[model samples]
Target chain A: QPTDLYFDFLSPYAWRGVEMAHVLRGSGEGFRLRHFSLVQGNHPQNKDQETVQWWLTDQPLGAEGGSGYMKYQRPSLNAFLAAHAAARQGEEKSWAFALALFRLHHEDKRDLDEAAFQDAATRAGLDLSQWKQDRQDEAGLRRELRADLEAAAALGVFGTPTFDLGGGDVAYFKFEELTRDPQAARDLWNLFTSTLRSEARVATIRRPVP
Target chain B: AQPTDLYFDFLSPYAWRGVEMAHVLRGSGEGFRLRHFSLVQGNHPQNKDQETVQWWLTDQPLGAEGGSGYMKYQRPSLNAFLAAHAAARQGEEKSWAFALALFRLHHEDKRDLDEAAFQDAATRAGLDLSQWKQDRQDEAGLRRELRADLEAAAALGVFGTPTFDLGGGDVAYFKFEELTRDPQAARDLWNLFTSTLRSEARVATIRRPVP
Candidate 1:
């Protein structure tokens, strides 16, 4: 059965997030991938305009070596292209591309908004022209993005990098808490899978065994 | 050299501790620009938030929060703003040393920092004894200092301290890092010195609250 990963491309933290569940389980032959966009709740910016602006942008100050990589930074665009492309190919490469993009933009401070996005997608061993077709699927892409956000709203998932491991138990994660510590990322992965497998939760139909 | 400015209230314990940090930052030496102003909470007593705290501590006799406030009131801080202004005029480093001594005596010892013990601490910090005594006792000069401190504090829209602002788009590390009991965590702030020297991101958090 497919595990639904409610994601937001606009969310920088999601970049590091290519199918981490599969890697953890070590043989996700039957795991399904469901990607969606989520709407965030509670805009704190009205209280302080500067704070709002800062929050809207994915500018990590102390980290990122000062590139101030935005969601659309060159490297991110590449990862976005690859994510869609990988979705077209299957699940394996999408996960790889997502991890690369996360480390690239969040850790290395590379701009993701460039012609190089295509180059990065190509390097991820994706078919460039075909991936480009998927990239230019503007109508479908917009619908998917909107669906992601609306689904988040419907499900009450306010922040980015949300996980729903099939049986209907959804988990929301804020970027900062995970960014500050790696162990948290590992923990959420285990918790989501366990909770998803519980009898009470809706199953995110996944593959049998490795 | 440019990043330090002392913030003292005639009656703030946390700011009193800041005196010690200021001293350590300057290599256990003294004297820096002084800015002493009352917390708006103190000036507008209605806005003071210690009510809930006192209520909590009411039955908990062993707790120190309630006692500390009463003790501060008893510690004889002259108009801190006025005193700071006068000290700033003498020299940046000189006034810082002497003022911190006053806070230490008042907050920790709970003694009359207004009297002899404070003068002795000033001497210990290497201030000229006679000049220190004369200037400290000068009521008119002290009032001038207070007015200046208020002006400075108000200008910054400072809600509270343990604050550090780069005047660039930088998140303040004051609250988190300062209180760390871990020495290594304390040293991590030295990296901020690099933030000034290296420039990469242009995003800034220079938002001041609406008055």
Candidate 2:
């Protein structure tokens, strides 16, 4: 199985990974595509928002320096609606669809309203009628999206586009090498995946008392 | 006897400057193969947290008064690169022409990317008006090119372009921080590119994201 990609399509960084994933997928290389969503801040009760406001203002230059590896544009997101709609329509290639959305709204300065969203949706080969119905009827994907983030955090996640090798806890290594030294990333990933199996066996043996 | 391998992108100022440098480098009989790459936007991430780049974006706004001593003094960069996407499909010659036009748009007209003028500038660069309509219909072509670029980028450990890997050799490396417009620099790079071709140094095992 390929790594389960944890991302929110509304993010530019997520868009970056989406494009990268699409690039990898298009290459016909031996890889698996496991797509999943995460809330931008792991909360739906607006708790994450309060936390962000505080962190952005209070984080020391050092902590800020470290946490700030990637800049985010904070594009307004309709997380559940978008992903659930796309998935509902069987648009497994939602990476392209999401990227088109980001390119239009974030980069090209287009609006993200319903008309704008529909335009992008139509452009991405999604049937707007189905999208709208999905949005109205079973719009329960919002919490599901947030739950994805919570589940990721429970398993130790720090950011989007994280690669889970399933050997041990999901390992989140810096992806700079994906662009700089891809072979290094591949080698590391393979090594980590093999390492996960043995580690999981070890975990099964560990007692809570210990 | 090796050609220049340019790792390029539609959204990079440094890559644009390097492309311009290659034009001057190849002006003599020293012409090299200009390979365009779809290297993504964002400078290399300096940390695992993903917050390192945010500071750069907010702190590094260009055209500051005292900071104008470098390249911007000679030629300011076209900060926005959307035209690069359209220009890439128009053919390499047209892409160079597109680069020139965008440079003017950035340095001269200072037109932000959204203005209709950017497309006008593209038209001046010889892009067919209809091609963009048809090309975008199948964005897969550009995506495919980017995918090839990602594989090449991964194999070589290319964090950023204006970076040269001097293909086909072990320990091949180059950085634009050492950029020069002089022939001596070109000769130095040529020697490196050639030495690598003769050696068994350059090899990459591709990393597909979920392979």
Best model number under lDDT: 2
Model 1 Cα lDDT, one tens digit per residue, A68-185? 3333333323344346655676566665555555555556666555444554565567776777788777445445444544555555554455655444456543222222223443
CAPRI tier of model 2: incorrect
DockQ of each model against the real complex? 0.03, 0.01
Which lDDT tens digits does candidate 2 get at residues B68-133? 322232112222233455566777677667766765565446664343655766777878868865
Q: Give the per-residue lDDT digits (tens) of candidate 1, residues B88-116.
A: 45676667666766666666677753546
Which residue runs does candidate 1 get wrong by more than 4 Å? A1-210, B1-3, B10-19, B27-32, B40-78, B84-90, B106-117, B165-173, B176-187, B193-211
lDDT of 2 by residue, A22-73 (tens): 5555443233323333333443432434232222112222321253322331
Worst 10 residues of 2 chain B by lDDT: B202-211
Q: How close is candidate 2 to the true structure, as a TM-score?
A: 0.35
- True-vs-predicted CA distance for residue A149, candidate 1, Å: 18
Give TM-scores of chain A for all candidates.
0.57, 0.58
